[PDB]
Amino acid sequence: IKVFTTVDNINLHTQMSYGQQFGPTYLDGADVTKIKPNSHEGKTFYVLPNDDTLRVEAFEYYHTTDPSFLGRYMSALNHTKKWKYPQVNGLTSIKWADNNCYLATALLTLQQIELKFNPPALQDAYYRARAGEAANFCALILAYCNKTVGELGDVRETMSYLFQHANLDSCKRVLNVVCKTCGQQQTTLKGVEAVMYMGTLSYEQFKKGVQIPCTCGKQATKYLVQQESPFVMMSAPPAQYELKHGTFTCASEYTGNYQCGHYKHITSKETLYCIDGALLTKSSEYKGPITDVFYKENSYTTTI
Numbered sequence: 001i002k003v004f005t006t007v008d009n010i011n012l013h014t015q016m017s018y019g020q021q022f023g024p025t026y027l028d029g030a031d032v033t034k035i036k037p038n039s040h041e042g043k044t045f046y047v048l049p050n051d052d053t054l055r056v057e058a059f060e061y062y063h064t065t066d067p068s069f070l071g072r073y074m075s076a077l078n079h080t081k082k083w084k085y086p087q088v089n090g091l092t093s094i095k096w097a098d099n100n101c102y103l104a105t106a107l108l109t110l111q112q113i114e115l116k117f118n119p120p121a122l123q124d125a126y127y128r129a130r131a132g133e134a135a136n137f138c139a140l141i142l143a144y145c146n147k148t149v150g151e152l153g154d155v156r157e158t159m160s161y162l163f164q165h166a167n168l169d170s171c172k173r174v175l176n177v178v179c180k181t182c183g184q185q186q187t188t189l190k191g192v193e194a195v196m197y198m199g200t201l202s203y204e205q206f207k208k209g210v211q212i213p214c215t216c217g218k219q220a221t222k223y224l225v226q227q228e229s230p231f232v233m234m235s236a237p238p239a240q241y242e243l244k245h246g247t248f249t250c251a252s253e254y255t256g257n258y259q260c261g262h263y264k265h266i267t268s269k270e271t272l273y274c275i276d277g278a279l280l281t282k283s284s285e286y287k288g289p290i291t292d293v294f295y296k297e298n299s300y301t302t303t304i
C-alpha cells in the first residue's frame with residue numbers, strides 16, 4: 001500500500017502486508033509497529049529518523065538528536081489527545097487528568113507572557129495552543145522536559161526547561177550587591193538567569209533589596225539595578241501571600257507538601273480569577289499559598 005511517511009509533518013515523503021518495513025512507526029499517537037498496512041492508505045505516518053535526510057530534517061524541526069524524543073513524544077501524545085482543553089476566560093486550560101495540574105498552570109502562564117521558541121516544533125505548536133489545539137503542545141512540553149504522563153511535575157522546573165529552549169538573548173539583568181565590609185559588587189545576568197529568581201515573590205522587594213550572604217558571614221543586600229526583559233518570574237517556597245489586583249500578571253498556587261500537592265493558577269484581569277483546570281472562581285482580593293508570581297516588564301532602571 002502506497003503511503004506517506006514523515007518526521008515533522010512538514011516535509012512529507014511518499015514511500016506489503018511496520019517494524020521490518022519502517023521501524024518504529026506511529027499513526028496519530030498509536031504505535032502501529034506491530035501492525036500490518038487498508039484504511040491506512042495515503043495517511044501520513046510518523047517514523048523514527050533512519051536516513052541522513054530525516055536525521056537533518058529532525059533537527060530543523062525539533063532541534064534535538066535524541067532518538068528517544070519521538071518515542072517519548074508519541075507516548076505523551078496518546079494521552080494529551082484524549083485530554084479535554086476548555087476555554088476558561090479566553091484561555092485554554094486542561095481538565096484534570098493524569099496529574100496535569102502543573103501543566104495546566106504552565107499553559108495558562110504561557111498564554112499571558114511573551115515567549116519565542118527556538119525549535120519550530122515548539123513555536124508552531126505554541127500558536128496552535130492559543131487557538132485551542134493544545135494537544136501537540138502539551139506532549140512536546142513533556143518531551144522537552146524529560147517527563148512522562150502521570151508523573152508529578154513542578155511549574156518552576158518546567159518553565160525553566162522551556163526558557164532555555166527559547167530566545168531570551170536580549171534579556172539582561174544588572175544586579176548590585178553591597179557588603180558592610182567587602183564593598184559594592186556589580187553583576188550582570190543574561191538569558192534564562194535574567195528573568196527568574198528563587199527567593200522572594202515581590203518584584204518590589206527585589207528592587208528595594210533582598211538580604212543575601214557574601215563570602216563573609218556579614219549580611220549583604222541584593223537589589224535590582226537594571227532590568228531589560230518582557231517579563232520576570234518571581235519564585236519562593238510555598239508560603240502565605242496576598243495578591244493585589246493589578247500589581248501582578250499571573251501567579252501559581254501550590255497546596256500540599258513537597259512533591260505531594262496540587263497546583264492552581266491565579267491571574268489578574270478586571271478582577272482576580274482562579275483557574276482549577278475547568279473550574280473558575282472570582283475574587284477581589286486573594287490570599288493563599290503562592291509559590292510563583294509573574295510580572296511584566298520592558299525596561300527598568302533603579303534610582304540608587
Ligand SMILES: Cc1ccc(OCCN(C)C)cc1C(=O)N[C@H](C)c1cc(-c2cnn(CC(=O)N(C)C)c2)nc2ccccc12
Pocket residue numbers: 152153154157237238254256257258259260261291
Ligand atoms: C510538586 C512537585 C513536583 C516535583 C518537584 O521536583 C523538585 C525536585 N527537583 C529538585 C528535581 C517539586 C514539587 C513541589 O512540591 N514543588 C513545590 C513548589 C514545593 C513545595 C514545598 C513544600 C510544601 N510543603 N512542604 C512541607 C513538607 O513537605 N513537609 C513534609 C512538612 C514543602 N517546598 C518546596 C521547596 C522548594 C521548591 C519547591 C517546593
Ligand SMILES: [Cl-]
Pocket residue numbers: 063
Ligand atoms: Cl539547539
Ligand SMILES: [Cl-]
Pocket residue numbers: 079080082083097098
Ligand atoms: Cl488520558
Ligand SMILES: [Cl-]
Pocket residue numbers: 096097098099100101102262
Ligand atoms: Cl492533578
Ligand SMILES: [Cl-]
Pocket residue numbers: 063118119164165166
Ligand atoms: Cl533550542
Ligand SMILES: [Cl-]
Pocket residue numbers: 246247248249294295296
Ligand atoms: Cl505586571
Ligand SMILES: [Cl-]
Pocket residue numbers: 101260261262263
Ligand atoms: Cl494533586
Ligand SMILES: [Zn+2]
Pocket residue numbers: 011012013053
Ligand atoms: Zn525529504
Ligand SMILES: [Zn+2]
Pocket residue numbers: 063118119
Ligand atoms: Zn535549538
Ligand SMILES: [Zn+2]
Pocket residue numbers: 079097098149
Ligand atoms: Zn491518560
Ligand SMILES: [Zn+2]
Pocket residue numbers: 064144165
Ligand atoms: Zn533539550
Ligand SMILES: [Zn+2]
Pocket residue numbers: 179182183214215216
Ligand atoms: Zn567580599
Ligand SMILES: [Zn+2]
Pocket residue numbers: 179180181182183214215216218220
Ligand atoms: Zn562581604
Ligand SMILES: [Zn+2]
Pocket residue numbers: 245246
Ligand atoms: Zn482593584
Ligand SMILES: [Zn+2]
Pocket residue numbers: 099100101102261262263
Ligand atoms: Zn495536581
